[PDB]
Amino acid sequence: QVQELEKKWYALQVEPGKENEAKENLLKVLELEGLKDLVDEVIVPAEEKVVIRAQGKEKYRLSLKGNARDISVLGKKGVTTFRIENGEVKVVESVEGDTCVNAPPISKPGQKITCKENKTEAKIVLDNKIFPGYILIKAHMNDKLLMAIEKTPHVFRPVMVGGKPVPLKEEEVQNILNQIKR
Numbered sequence: 001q002v003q004e005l006e007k008k009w010y011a012l013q014v015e016p017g018k019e020n021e022a023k024e025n026l027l028k029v030l031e032l033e034g035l036k037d038l039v040d041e042v043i044v045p046a047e048e049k050v051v052i053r054a055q056g057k058e059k060y061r062l063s064l065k066g067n068a069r070d071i072s073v074l075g076k077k078g079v080t081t082f083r084i085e086n087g088e089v090k091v092v093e094s095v096e097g098d099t100c101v102n103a104p105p106i107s108k109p110g111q112k113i114t115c116k117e118n119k120t121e122a123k124i125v126l127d128n129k130i131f132p133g134y135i136l137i138k139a140h141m142n143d144k145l146l147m148a149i150e151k152t153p154h155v156f157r158p159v160m161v162g163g164k165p166v167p168l169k170e171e172e173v174q175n176i177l178n179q180i181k182r
Helices: 019-033 143-150 170-178
Strands: 008-015 039-043 047-054 059-063 070-073 079-084 087-094 112-115 120-127 133-141 155-156
Touching: 008 019, 008 170, 019 039, 019 143, 019 170, 039 087, 047 070, 047 079, 059 070, 087 112, 087 120, 143 155
Parallel strands: none
Antiparallel strands: 008 133, 008 155, 039 133, 047 059, 047 120, 070 079, 079 087, 112 120
């Protein structure tokens, strides 16, 4: 037991609706500012979902986590079937000429698979209904990290008392994470 220095959880107030962007911006800020060693985790307390569209129209909005589901939609030319399983999305089959059948599986918010020939698509998004305007970080808090957080594009500070970021116990994080699962 050496790097015993524990990182704690902190809640970051961020632009509502831009929580994923806030996370990706913070990740890049940490890289630039040389702060990655201080942070073990950055999580958006929101459920990951798969949005399936066909000809620019939403057909399904499903939980990314689940047993293993196939979904077929009618497109411009025919059927695209998408598979959602082990937290990934890929195409089983589509119309002739659709290269999306060989697209690597996607799993992170923002990613998408586009079947250009059939005009269907699967996109991974976050459902920020329960805890909008927040990301969570597990970190060693200090002055440089605090300041870097406040200068990250879609981030507006940690929850603080007297300028001191308020740590959340493991239990409370698990709790809110259990509310974005249930």
